[model samples]
Target chain A: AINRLQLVATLVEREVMRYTPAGVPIVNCLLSYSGQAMEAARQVEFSIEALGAGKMASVLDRIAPGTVLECVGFLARKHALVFHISGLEHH
Target chain B: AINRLQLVATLVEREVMRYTPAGVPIVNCLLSYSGQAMEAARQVEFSIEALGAGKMASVLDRIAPGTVLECVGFLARKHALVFHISGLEHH
Candidate 1:
């Protein structure tokens, strides 16, 4: 499965970090992108879930709403379109 | 929304083309992929939806399970993670 996504979206919401049963950090973020897409809509929001060790949480901590972030990840279904993020690059 | 996905997956399942109230055709497909990703998993499956006129249905008709397809689309949430397909390419 070569499921890769390169997205540049604005941080719309940030949730507090939670831990998995194995003590891994899980962060949920809402990102909004306003541009053209497959549909005729101009913008949409997506919920992204990032799970990792402390390093990923540290990266998420430095991010803020309204800041545009470039993300690379793969798509997986949890409830909605949850992007299981791999890396976040600031731009 | 700048929601885009470039996926290389095998067609696991394909549904017969159905029509909407307006008589437009809609095709549903299940795709599975296996490789490295955000998580440590090797494979995953996703459902894709394609909506259009006769052209899209015709394309869907020619596709079959076990065929690897290159797909470009936008991710959307209806009931689950749905890839709203925009284009389908053969290789």
Candidate 2:
């Protein structure tokens, strides 16, 4: 069994940093896409664990809102379909 | 702008048929998977439009809880991460 989600989308919304009860860093964001994969334009919100907090968060900020990124993650529900991004590569 | 999600999982839950405002038949199910794609076992709930209602509903019911299925769908938010399954093939 394999449970993976690959998303190629534009950053419609900027990252919003949050923390766990234990003070772990987490970032939430929204992505929008429109292409053959979908009959109509769609948007999805997902999250990722930021190592060192500002480390990955800073890199994500430098990326413009319209920049497209290919992200590899797994699907999990956290009030919604949250992509637990593991890796992100820009194209 | 491509939006897609491929999931390979076992049928942890059966189809729960429901209707749209226009009376369209939609079936929802839960799938569980665990492998390289995930750090741990994960379960996702998704929905699909059944053409004839009974068409997919019957097929899904025939599939045992432990049966494996490869589903191709797209990600969308519906109170949580819900996979809008488009195609399914048992393997």
Candidate 3:
């Protein structure tokens, strides 16, 4: 099975960084996006929870809120849906 | 901004079809997926809520539970996160 997500959104909020027992850095953030739906004439918009771990966590920590970025990631469940970022760049 | 998701998952459950006020067909279903996370090298699995509207709704209505499929969609919030399917095919 495959699970992937590509989104261009603004980093709305970020929590303090943490470390797993294995010492991998982790950061949790919120992302917001608004765009036209491919299948519908109406607009689509939402805010979602996102997680950045290891190197990605450090990268997210350095970015300030309100920065628009192109994020490539995958989805996983941790109580609820979370976007696990794999890569990102300025939009 | 862009919002796109591509997933291969199983159709776990589907509710009875309905229609919008404008008569566009609508279907809500549950989908489950398990796969290797691209960065983690670990198994990732979850079940999520998915919505199919208009033509996509009719397509979902024909699929049976437990059928594996490749789904292309976007995430949107309707109280909680929902995968709004734009396309699908048998896996």
Candidate 4:
């Protein structure tokens, strides 16, 4: 089974980095996307909760807000829907 | 910019088909996924709201609940997060 989300969006909000009991770093943020959908041919816009952990978390902590990134991740329900980022790159 | 989600899930709930003012068919459904994440190496599970329109909607309407499918779509916020399905196939 597959559950993946690939998004090109701007990092709108980044919370302070934290650590798990295992001492793995984690960073939480909000991503905003405003663009046209190729298939729907309509303007699509939304803000989604996202997080990065371990190495990805360390990298996300150093990035400034408003930076556009191409993020590859999976979605999980944690209180609400959240994107668990596995990889990312500046767009 | 891009926002896409590809998932393999089971259709749990499907609403009766409806039509837009333009006469296009529309169907709303809920999809549930339970499996391990390849990257995170942890169990992943969630249910999400999804919808299909036009020919895709017609196809979804005929599918039985609990059918496993591979769905390709994009996320949109319509009150809450919703997956706008563009394509799908039985898995």
TM-scores, one per candidate: 0.71, 0.60, 0.97, 0.95
Cα-lDDT of candidate 2:
0.58
Residue A90 of model 3 has an lDDT of 94
Query: Candidates' DockQ values?
Result: 0.50, 0.44, 0.85, 0.78
**Model 2 pairs in collision:** A80-B80, A80-B81, A81-B80, A81-B81
By descending DockQ, how would the candidates be arranged? 3, 4, 1, 2
Q: What's the i-RMS of each model?
A: 3.3, 5.0, 1.0, 1.4
Q: Rate the local accuracy (lDDT) of all candidates.
A: 0.65, 0.58, 0.92, 0.91
| Error in Å for residue A85 of model 1 | 2.1
Shift of residue A25 alpha carbon in model 1, Å: 3.3
Off by over 4 Å in 4: none
lDDT of 3 by residue, B8-85 (tens): 999999999998898999899999998898765969999999989988999999999999989998888876988999
Q: Which regions of candidate 3 deviate over 4 angstroms?
A: none
lDDT of 2 by residue, A1-91 (tens): 5556677776666656666675656666666654554423344554332221333445565677778888766665455245666668896
TM-score of chain B of each: 0.75, 0.69, 0.95, 0.93
Candidate that beats the other on TM-score, 1 or 4, i.e. the better one: 4
List model 4 lDDT by residue over A6-88, tens digit each: 99999998999999898989899999999888544889999999999899899999999999999999999875789999989
Q: What is the TM-score of chain A in candidate 1?
A: 0.76
Q: What share of the true interface contacts does candidate 3 keep?
A: 0.86
